[PDB]
Recover the amino acids of this structure.
């Protein structure tokens, strides 16, 4: 019927298959300087308790391309993130994207403005090259800092970029500009937590704001930081320490489809 | 039944109302009473003992009578008496014991103990000295079917239960929203916890509720209502509702508003009170309903601002809490209390001699399961054994 | 009211034994009774009316005595008797109604009509013939704390409540499992249902449990147990617990295995039954527990094969069933039944005179809501009013 | 709001009791025959009058049946797909409905390394992409070949070739070694969790062929598989929009998307 969240359940105080996907960047498979590692890692995971057929490696060329439509492939998804001293923002955008679940609608910029419902609303724009120009309106629907029917007047907020999590003031409409042939934009809201994906930042200084509100920028126990000099040491740091990690995650939050955000065609 | 109380209070008055010296008038009544009690008790063979491990015991009575014409009491009198005095004490203690472990599924108003069942025969109904104490009085009024009751300091009436109602939850356990409550003896301490701090509820206000059904009807009781629960205000780790893991809970208290207490009877409101604390009164009721609310404050301050966002990551959950304690009451159904040694004596007797156990009681007179399934037939059996226990508490410890 | 039964049975003896030709000694104990009533009834003023549509009636009695020298009765004597017999019947009927048309939370074990309240004191205690019917004798034995018990055939002790419970479900409703029960009157019928035929169950076993609390205790109860459910055995449609949608149910019956009947008192399994259908006996119980399991049949033939598919798109639904009906009881508090008019009598007298319902009994004397909040106050009131109704029923022809 | 546990929910049985988006999949041949533009606004205004708002109708285009196979997207509130029949591509339409009439939780695997066993009748191997040519070799429990040898790509047995999408299964209870080029398509170990009630299929041409699950003993013609004929596509469209009430009547909101499943499995 409805799974019945409308009759409470009362226990007491006196009563007491498996999958794992492992994401990694490409320069790791470079520094390995081998070609048959997957087998050995499998055997080791077997030692720790996982049956042959549960250690899956997915690979992305870079933090940029992996942005396009992130993929969920396991009930446990751990992702390795190579640090940048100059690309940190996009890193935090990736974390804010996949760590949480989004509920997104498609945006046809042709015939309507848009407005956001509450503070939980944002715009996820994805693609290989995404140029997002904007400008807001007034009470009588007039361009400001922009001539509403002239494009070069629009405000360049992210240029030919790859992943953007736009947030705009709530209660004010806006006109948009996008070359849709090379990108997509989606109007969504943040639903809440996920417990399937975790990120290990190789190197880095724990720069991760998964909030749009500034007054907070915390870290749940799902963002782990590790220092590194050669990848094999880090793979061992992971595989020798799977247990704490699993005790952090909680499998039940797997979603059926493969897309990171719920779509409403 | 009451004949036993006659025996007991007579022997008390024997041990005490007679001391060396007194004038004949002061106890003349009692001396005649006791001489008649003597000429009564003799001449009837008794066998007492033979259940569990209590030994079979033969009993006969043959003793002279007491001085009937005297000026001032002398020690020879009390010396002649105390022997048979203590002998009677021993026999009546045996009566109490032999009685206070019997079982009866369908009865418990007539005797069930051999010498006792013999003794409630009308042929002895010449020893009814006086019936002046709570239990015997309630008994001899329950026989004549009037309004009756006992007054209790700290009545142990709410069955002990540690259970918690859940109204919003998910198997990640980061947005709990529910209520916990603990019940024991005379007190009930409740708290309602919100992770969200009513940040998504309608009207910046959220509700908590609690129902407590008693198992018997009380009347005219004192309720101490204190608006700050103590037992639910600290970091706790409690197990899940069906059990695969545990979960955590770190509350923080705020003061409740718009609270409502109601004592209802048979589905009808009898007492209803709004945000009044301290001491309140109950007149006729068996159901307690508590309904209160938690509000997100209209304005905040720095720490209050860091602790209550709208965001997902919550770390300090908030709570509200109430304590309702029934301190003294008057009731019809007999209840074990914390002002005497009755239930204690019952359990000591049961342990003392290894009674055959049946469903006429929960095994061992452990109070919890008993009041859980409080049954009027069990109540009859219990009242009988309790009056006999109190009778015992007048003679010997 | 004791006096009331006295008057009632006496007037009945009058109507049944005073006829032409009978020898005087055969009505001797009769006449010496009736005239005695005239001795205490004369010159006494009674008032009725002043509550409900009961009209005001003021009653004086001045009829003389009946003849005592005549040996064999004739038409004249019996007619002169009946002349005042009818008057006495009317008066007693009216006071009966009076005691019927009021309730009280203030103990209903005392008389409620000013008429009977006056009639109660010593100036009328000389009114008694005997007690021969169960109601008046039970009243006497209860107000004296002795054994008490009414014999019922086909009584209602289950609040009619037709609902169902869900353990496995989803909106589309093509995977369901749970159990539907109905306790209507004395008739319990339970049925566990499954859609997957235990295809995911450990070793093809699915458990099912059902609990029902009795509103009062029974003893020495005779019940009959039948191995199916003669009510939940046809394709139907059932709402949801939220009334939004409507789901299907095309049942096909198996035979339930390891059926388990536990008649429980206070938590001790008093009467135990494994697969004993037909009549069964429960010597003392007040809670009923029914336990069983759906077992997937191990070996399958072509028809049975197509019905239960290992695949996901299901067609039929498997169901275990059980039925129970109580055929008599000896109980400690009165309940409605299939052999009484007393409930009927009281409903009728209330409904004739449009009496505004009071604070205890339910509106219009609806039985289920009545038994729902069955309170000791209510039980005393109800036994009173049904003793009233029995007084009435033993006189209205 | 305990999204965690299946709790007992209870209701009575004798008491009185009692927008969103619509989309349209259609193949090209319709539009080709049409040779117009306004038919889009035509259908939308007709629906509008029928009782759905504007901004609520959509249309997607797949060049060919075999084409639409490429990891299709079904993310609309109520999806109605029309399919042109073919006397040559049976497995195509059937597997199409299967992957569409149901939803599958499904893990990936790295074929370069691993061996596999499939648990039950609801765990299948789904190959999708451009073109698959997949080859299987069972193993003896001693890592020795049977009917094949672990070291050559043609001793294996063929079960598909250059097809658009394949649902393959083996004898449940034996390991396996797999060869197919990851480049030209990808394989996933998937599992049909249940029936999807968010999509309906209309056969144009042909007859009842579709088999909504693998076992032969079952091939139910559920109320979720409809069938109409054709001589001009306009009759088809006008019928569909006529009884569209009845179409959506046999439909129900995607359970996996409703708020009632924050954590059971979403979408």
């Amino acid at each position: 019927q409805n799974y019945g969240i409308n009759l409470p359940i009362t226990g007491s105080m006196d009563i007491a298959t498996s999958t794992l996907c492992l994401y990694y960047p490409t320069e790791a498979a470079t520094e390995i300087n081998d070609n048959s590692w997957k087998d050995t890692l499998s055997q080791l995971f077997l030692t720790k308790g996982w049956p042959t057929g549960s250690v899956y490696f997915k690979e992305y060329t870079n933090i940029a391309s992996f942005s396009v439509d992130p993929q969920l492939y396991c009930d446990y998804n751990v992702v390795l993130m190579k640090y940048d001293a100059t690309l940190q923002l996009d890193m935090s955008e990736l974390a804010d994207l996949i760590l949480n679940e989004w509920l997104c609608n498609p945006m046809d910029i042709t015939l309507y403005y848009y407005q956001q419902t509450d503070e939980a609303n944002k715009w996820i724009s994805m693609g290989s090259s995404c140029t997002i120009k904007v400008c807001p309106l007034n009470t009588q629907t007039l361009g400001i800092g922009c001539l509403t029917t002239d494009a070069t007047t629009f405000e360049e907020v992210a240029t030919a970029e790859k992943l953007v999590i736009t947030d705009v003031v709530d209660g004010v409409n806006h006109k948009l500009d996008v070359t849709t042939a090379t990108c997509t934009i989606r109007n969504c809201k943040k639903l809440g937590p996920r417990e399937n994906v975790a990120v290990i930042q190789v190197g880095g200084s724990d720069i991760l704001d998964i909030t749009a509100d500034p007054t907070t920028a915390p870290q749940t126990e799902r963002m782990m930081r590790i220092n590194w000099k050669k990848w094999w040491q880090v793979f061992y740091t992971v595989v020798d320490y799977v247990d704490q990690i699993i005790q952090v995650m909680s499998k039940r939050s797997r979603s059926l489809n493969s897309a990171a955000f719920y779509y409403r065609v | 039944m009451d004949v036993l109380y006659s025996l007991s209070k007579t022997l008390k008055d024997a041990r005490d109302k007679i001391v060396e010296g007194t004038l004949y008038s002061n106890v003349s009544d009692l001396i005649q009473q006791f001489n008649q009690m003597i000429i009564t008790m003799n001449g009837n063979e008794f066998q007492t003992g033979g259940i569990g491990n209590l030994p079979i015991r033969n009993w006969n009575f043959n003793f002279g009578l007491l001085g009937t014409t005297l000026l001032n009491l002398d020690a020879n009198y009390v010396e002649t008496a105390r022997n048979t005095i203590d002998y009677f004490v021993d026999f009546v203690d045996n009566v109490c014991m032999d009685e206070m472990v019997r079982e009866s599924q369908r009865n418990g108003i007539a005797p069930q103990s051999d010498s006792l069942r013999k003794l409630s025969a009308i042929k002895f109904k010449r020893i009814n000295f006086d019936n002046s104490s709570e239990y015997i009085e309630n008994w001899n009024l329950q026989n004549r079917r009037q309004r009756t009751g006992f007054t209790f300091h700290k009545p142990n009436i709410f069955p002990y239960s540690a259970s918690f109602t859940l109204n919003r939850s998910q198997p990640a356990h980061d947005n709990l929203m529910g209520t916990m409550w603990l019940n024991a003896g005379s007190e009930i301490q409740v708290a309602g916890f919100d992770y969200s701090c009513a940040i998504n509820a309608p009207a910046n206000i959220q509700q908590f509720e609690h129902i407590v059904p008693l198992r018997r009807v009380l009347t005219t009781a004192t309720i101490t209502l204190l608006p700050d629960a103590e037992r639910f205000s600290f970091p706790r780790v409690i197990n899940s509702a069906d059990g695969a893991t545990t979960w955590f809970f770190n509350p923080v208290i705020l003061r409740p508003n718009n609270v409502e207490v109601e004592f209802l009877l048979n589905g009808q409101i009898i007492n209803t009170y709004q945000a009044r604390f301290g001491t309140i009164v109950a007149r006729n009721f068996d159901t307690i309903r508590l309904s209160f609310q938690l509000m997100r404050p209209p304005n905040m301050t720095p720490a209050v601002a860091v602790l209550f966002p709208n965001a997902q990551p919550f770390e300090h959950h908030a709570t509200v809490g109430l304590t309702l304690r029934i301190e003294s009451a008057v009731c019809e159904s007999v209840l074990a209390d914390a002002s005497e040694t009755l239930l204690a004596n019952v359990t000591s007797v049961r342990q003392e001699y290894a009674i055959p156990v049946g469903p006429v009681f929960p095994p061992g007179m452990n109070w919890t399961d008993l009041i859980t399934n409080y049954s009027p037939s069990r109540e009859d059996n219990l009242q009988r054994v309790f009056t006999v226990a109190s009778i015992r508490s007048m003679l010997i410890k």
